[PDB]
Amino acid sequence: YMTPMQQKLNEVYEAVKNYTDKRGRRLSAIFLRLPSRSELPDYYLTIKKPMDMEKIRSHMMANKYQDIDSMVEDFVMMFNNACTYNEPESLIYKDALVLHKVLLETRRDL
């Protein structure tokens, strides 16, 4: 679609968005948009800096990322948030770990 760095940003975003496991489950589904404060109040009690993929996507679509590693840092904050709020035995916790590996593998390639 356009410039090298915009393309790299898009590739990072899409890799995490589109990832599917062996059963065809899209792990990013629950991460697109945070519920409201009344819907998930314990998250907002626990997490200093709320983050979801729609937030990252908006920032990206408005050309506000000046490098790739800023975008990577926002995803890492998202997954760190998930693994701070949720217990290790939860599925969302395990999904966050997987997608954090997906993110880094993508970044490693450029």
Ligand SMILES: CCCCc1n[nH]c2oc(=O)c3ccccc3c12
């Ligand atoms: C039952 C809905 C649970 C949604 C949810 N639980 N824990 C989460 O941690 C997150 O970091 C996160 C990020 C974006 C959207 C949802 C969640 C989330």
